[PDB]
Design an enzyme around this catalytic site. Structure first.
Site, mmCIF file in Angstrom:
data_model
loop_
_atom_site.group_PDB
_atom_site.id
_atom_site.type_symbol
_atom_site.label_atom_id
_atom_site.label_comp_id
_atom_site.label_asym_id
_atom_site.label_seq_id
_atom_site.Cartn_x
_atom_site.Cartn_y
_atom_site.Cartn_z
ATOM 1 N N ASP A 1 11.162 26.179 -19.658
ATOM 2 C CA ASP A 1 10.411 25.191 -18.876
ATOM 3 C C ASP A 1 10.640 25.392 -17.388
ATOM 4 O O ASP A 1 11.542 26.132 -17.019
ATOM 5 C CB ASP A 1 10.825 23.777 -19.293
ATOM 6 N N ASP B 1 0.955 17.617 -20.183
ATOM 7 C CA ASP B 1 1.585 17.389 -21.476
ATOM 8 C C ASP B 1 0.729 16.562 -22.374
ATOM 9 O O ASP B 1 0.053 15.656 -21.906
ATOM 10 C CB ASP B 1 2.887 16.644 -21.273
#
Lengths: 390, 390
Positions: B139, B200
């Site tokens: 990430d 997301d």
């Protein structure tokens, strides 16, 4: 409105959200707004014990009427789509032990563009009474000013009483009044059995969120006036269709019960999941909506993406609803002091809570000191009913 | 990324959307991110033939590590939540016939606030290779500049190869590059098996709409780079939970298939509607996602609240997906000239179309000249597969 009607929030079925203004019976003879559609919804309300469960009002919405008025100045059903006319349709519905709603508009036109009622209230009521109508939804499109609108609603209300027939009078008055000045709700209550407050519903969780949010942000205004013969109308039950998930549908049904809202389904009784039928017919849940007392629930608490709503019932009972507004993650745990619950009355000294939704498990006895822990689903609601030891 | 891996879009399960960063195993031992959770999901992927169906990667997301690094400068599992550590958890998974994912972050920290990998790529890769990790999700939280971020992603990629172990390399690189300049997708493709492009996902149709819409608004950029060993990642499958209706879940599954997306479920395999299982395991549909060709599909047509998507498959087959974006009314009819479809190839001269979703009815043979009529549900999709006479 003191016509002795809507002593509890009206339940029935209304074509609009699901069936809209469909005039094509060439290529889609099934959704087409036609007698065969009402005739079939009627036929079914009986078969699958919607009527048994309390839905009495088969309601027609916009787009039933012919392009213009006849020779005497009256409305008429569209010749081709309602060949038999309304008197007969009414007739048929009655025979199945049901009641018939129709739709009209205060102004120069309905929202569909069809003939409005400005100048015709007196005659138009009579027509309706004549046909055997049992309920009228009056809409507010296409009219000059608030002055006129305010008068039409009144004048129509009067007229219906004059025809001397019982007719549930369902008004879209308040909605059209913003944003031109808040409405006098006490006024409206004297004329209408129920009234539309916010935007239209469509098949979405968004829709639902926003109605809840708005009713929520405006409660002092409206929660207090509601009572037998005059309800707030947050719009139709869309449970059954395509837009909402299970927990979202429970959210609707639960919160429409807390809201002492009328319950008009807009869905297709001919193709309906059998678990949507389950929900939509939940006795205990319907009973909450129908609580003979008639006091409308309200939002107690708010924040951490949770909402607490509660409604006082007869016999010192209350309904409590906990919504999870967080649309991510898994089911969350929530806890309230049972003492800060039903105004501090329910659960003094002792409480008996049965969860009603999404399941109907009895939880135990709760001490006045006790806490309620509960797990809520993302976009779902937990609806509980509380009883006393007394 | 030429590691000879992800030759089709990776299938597995990832905890994040459904389980998020849950550290309370006091009051919620069941959602708590713990070995027992993975252990049990592993256990179940086998039992209910998730593995049979093609999902092979049991993936850990954020919040598995201890507050900081040990004595040697290595990460470590949280002592209390992963008492046994990863090497053993890995071990256990493999034995059931599965593969283990882990999560780390290019910068000074993970998004949770836990130890990042800036300055540690070399060592950290080794640690992972050491434990028997089969996939890494890297990430991009908490780091200086694009300069740095760009380098970490490259450097980490290199390092993993150096360990000499096969490890699927799943990057969040492109996502952290906007709005600081469009990303060089060719560049990223050289270093990552797949990559996250947009925001997301959460449990909502909103999320789904907006991913679809964005992927759609950006195809030239991304559609063309995707192929074996390098996929566009629109994020996890959230079918199974609370947020989406049936038709919405079909929209996701169908569209993730057209999108040659990786399929990582984030749901609770322990409590899952059995018809979410059905869909999630639809062979035919899964096939389309896994088409050995590896050409990513795209949005063909658009408007009147409809969308047409299609994908080229092997052996002159194609998938077509029709979405009804209108959130009101009932199911709508749509028609395309079968000729304007699979670039005009598929159905020249003839076509064999079986609807795959929402049902799996065979429709007939279609002439080059023929039209396809179909009816789509509000917020649903129709997924069709087309074959040639040849």
């Amino acid at each position: 409105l003191d016509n002795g009607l809507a002593r509890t929030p009206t339940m029935g079925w209304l074509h609009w959200e699901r069936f809209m203004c469909n005039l094509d019976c060439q290529e889609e003879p099934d959704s087409c707004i036609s007698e065969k559609l009402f005739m079939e919804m009627a036929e079914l309300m009986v078969s699958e014990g919607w009527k048994d469960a309390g839905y009495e009002y088969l309601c027609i919405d916009d787009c039933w009427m012919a392009p213009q008025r006849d020779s005497e100045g009256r409305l008429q059903a569209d010749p081709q789509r309602f060949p038999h006319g309304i008197r007969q349709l009414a007739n048929y519905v009655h025979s199945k032990g049901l009641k018939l709603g129709i739709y009209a508009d205060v102004g120069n036109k309905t929202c569909a563009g069809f003939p409005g009622s400005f100048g015709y209230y007196d005659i138009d009521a009579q027509t309706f009474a004549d046909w055997g109508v049992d309920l009228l939804k009056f809409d507010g499109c296409y009219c000059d000013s608030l002055e006129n609108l305010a008068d039409g609603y009144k004048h129509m209300s009067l007229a219906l009483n004059r025809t001397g027939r019982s007719i549930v009078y369902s008004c879209e008055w308040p909605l059209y009044m913003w944003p031109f000045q808040k409405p006098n709700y006490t006024e409206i209550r004297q004329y209408c059995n129920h009234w539309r407050n916010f935007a239209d519903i469509d098949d979405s969780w968004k829709s639902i969120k926003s109605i809840l949010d708005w009713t929520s942000f405006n409660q002092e205004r409206i929660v207090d006036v509601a009572g037998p013969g005059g309800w707030n109308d947050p719009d139709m039950l869309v449970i059954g269709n395509f837009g909402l998930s299970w927990n979202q549908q429970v959210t609707q049904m639960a919160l429409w019960a807390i809201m002492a809202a009328p319950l008009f389904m807009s869905n297709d009784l001919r193709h309906i999941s059998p678990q949507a039928k389950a929900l939509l017919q939940d006795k205990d849940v319907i009973a909450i909506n129908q609580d003979p007392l008639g006091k409308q629930g309200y939002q107690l608490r708010q924040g951490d993406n949770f909402e607490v709503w509660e409604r006082p019932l007869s016999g010192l009972a209350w309904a409590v609803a906990m919504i999870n507004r967080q649309e991510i993650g898994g089911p969350r745990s929530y806890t309230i002091a049972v003492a800060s619950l039903g105004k501090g009355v329910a659960c003094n000294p002792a409480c008996f809570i049965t969860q009603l939704l999404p399941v109907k498990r009895k939880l135990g006895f709760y001490e006045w000191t006790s806490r309620l822990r509960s797990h809520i689903n993302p976009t779902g609601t937990v609806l509980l009913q509380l009883e006393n030891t007394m």
